[PDB]
Design a protein around this ligand. Structure first.
Ligand SMILES: [Zn+2]
Lengths: 444, 133
């Protein structure tokens, strides 16, 4: 009765909340399943094929993963900046020297400029830690887990005073092939969970999302979690009469028989809030066997996170609220006129990983053994899809279009989804040319 | 359905607790509890950052997690619960009075709910390459 009343009582459906690129009207519509559509997994061994390996972490095994994460980025930045050599943290030096390490905190509280420490690599500093002083630094932006090269003075061997901080160097963009330049207009619709209001189980946001999909006739439909939110009050009260395993089947078949007429490809990517699935980051692709021959050609299961090439465009698909992972525990030197979401996006793009944060917050499980092999950037993705609880925004950072449509439903107030245009322009030109000219985030 | 669902929440809570990564100092005087894993390692393992002479130990060892999972598997494993009886007559009496094929199917459903987590992700797998090479 009272549940889902607020969702039905709103009458402000239709208006666009933000747009990026070129001005477009309301009649967004494509050819659907017509033409050639290429959805290929690219990068490392593809998005991990099996479920996983184990939940048993040998303590002396995470150290090698951390060492590789530090050393690869350090060596790449050394080659880029043409630095002669690095210096150990514990080696005193009156002359200015360059240090290689990772930013971290010396306590369990919120990181501040006074408590920033640098933890060195095992090859050079043998895993030492020294506090750093940022007073003599003009501009900086530091979060725990960031791998940078720090220029400074360390005279007493117990504190390093900054003089200059090197900027992160992102990996070069993907090189388009001649085959990718012969394709036509492509549409990518993106929606993120939850798909219901925070007090009802009618799944009406899912229903009218399916209706919007049917009316739009898009080409690709990327659906992020949580399809079954781990914070929904009825989930933890075990008041339901059906197992979440079966709740998964009805949620799947809802979209399956709702989007048959549209004919658009479906890419379902799980989220860490999926209570029914394995709580491991990265998360394996979903398992589902009740798929017909027609459905298998339209339904594709992709793990989380992953880098998927859609029509020759590398979309970075991740369900973690990485913006809230990073910006909530990051410090900066300028606060008057500075763009926050852009600097977190740049930091994400420059650290060459899907989750640079080390350590993470209290509640999220990561298995470090496969973190090194399934959470890195093969190439810099052309479009980033990063849902967040914060405000929706589409911005161009480092020549890359990052899209944050947010949640489809936000408690008792509606959220937003996004739709993106993509084509491949002429290969010749001024090098960088964003394939995704137009993005439009509209509230459901 | 409710029993399996509650088992699901309980096992999720346990696995998240394990992956929390809490470490405790072995020294009774220190009792240092930190979430950040230091890179200063001793022969036994990690070295406490508060006191310089001690070894940090995981708060929730893998043995505890495996024992808890085995306990959850065993409390709903009627197959090994029926063979534990020393007399076949009592086993048959208990099987034919309540352990109907539907009851056995429900017990096997709980056992398979546990076995889905116990099947691929594990601890019972021993890599020979790491052991020899
Ligand atoms: Zn101690």
């Amino acid at each position: 009765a009272t549940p889902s009343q607020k969702y039905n009582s709103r009458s402000n459906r239709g208006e666009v909340v933000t747009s990026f690129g070129l001005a477009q009207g309301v009649s967004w519509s494509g050819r659907g399943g017509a033409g050639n559509i290429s959805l290929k997994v690219l990068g490392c061994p593809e998005a991990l094929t099996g479920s996983y390996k184990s939940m048993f972490q040998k303590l002396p095994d995470i150290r090698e993963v951390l060492t590789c994460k530090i050393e690869e980025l350090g060596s790449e930045l050394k080659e880029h900046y043409k630095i002669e050599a690095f210096t150990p943290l514990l080696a005193p030096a009156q002359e200015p020297v360059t240090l290689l390490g990772q930013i971290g905190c010396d306590s369990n509280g919120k990181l501040n400029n006074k408590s920033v420490i640098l933890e060195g690599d095992r090859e050079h500093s043998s895993g030492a830690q020294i506090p750093v002083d940022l007073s003599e630094l003009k501009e900086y932006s530091l979060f725990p887990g960031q791998v940078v090269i720090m220029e400074g003075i360390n005279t007493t061997g117990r504190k390093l005073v900054a003089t200059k901080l090197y900027e992160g160097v992102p990996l070069p963009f993907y090189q388009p092939t001649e085959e990718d330049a012969d394709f036509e207009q492509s549409m990518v619709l993106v929606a993120c969970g939850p798909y219901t209001t925070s007090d009802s189980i009618t799944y009406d946001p899912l229903l009218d999302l399916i209706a919007v999909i049917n009316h739009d006739r898009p080409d690709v439909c990327i659906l992020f979690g949580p399809f079954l939110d781990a914070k929904h009050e009825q989930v933890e009260n075990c008041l339901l009469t059906s197992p979440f395993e079966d709740i998964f089947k009805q949620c799947l078949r809802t979209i399956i028989e709702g989007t048959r007429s549209s004919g658009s490809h479906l890419v379902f990517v799980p989220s860490l809030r999926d209570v029914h699935h394995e709580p491991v980051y990265p998360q394996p692709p979903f398992s589902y066997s009740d798929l017909s021959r027609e459905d298998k050609k339209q339904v594709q299961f992709v793990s989380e996170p992953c880098s998927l090439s859609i029509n020759g465009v590398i979309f970075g698909l991740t369900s973690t609220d990485l913006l809230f992972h990073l910006g909530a525990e990051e410090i900066s030197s300028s606060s008057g006129t500075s763009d926050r979401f852009s600097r977190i996006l740049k930091h994400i793009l420059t650290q060459r990983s899907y989750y640079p944060l080390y350590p993470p917050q209290e509640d999220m499980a990561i298995d470090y053994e496969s973190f090194y092999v399934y959470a890195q950037l093969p190439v810099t993705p052309d479009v980033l899809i990063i849902p967040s609880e914060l405000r929706y925004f589409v911005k161009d950072v480092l020549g890359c279009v990052c899209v944050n449509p947010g949640r489809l439903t936000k408690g008792q107030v509606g959220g937003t989804f996004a739709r993106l245009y993509l084509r491949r322009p002429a290969a010749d030109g001024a090098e960088r040319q964003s394939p995704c000219i137009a993005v439009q985030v509209v509230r459901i | 359905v409710q029993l399996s669902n509650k088992l699901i929440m309980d096992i999720r809570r346990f696995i998240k607790k394990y992956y929390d990564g809490w470490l405790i100092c072995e020294e009774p005087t220190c009792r240092n509890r930190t979430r950040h894993l230091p890179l200063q390692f001793s022969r036994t393992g990690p070295l406490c950052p508060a006191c310089m002479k001690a070894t940090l130990q995981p708060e929730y060892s893998d043995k505890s997690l495996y024992t808890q999972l085995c306990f959850y598997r065993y409390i709903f494993d009627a197959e090994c619960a029926l063979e534990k009886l020393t007399t076949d007559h009592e086993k048959d009496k208990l099987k034919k009075q309540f352990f109907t094929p539907k009851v056995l199917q429900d017990y096997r459903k709980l056992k398979n709910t546990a076995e889905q987590f116990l099947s691929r992700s594990g601890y019972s797998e021993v890599n020979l390459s790491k052991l020899f090479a």
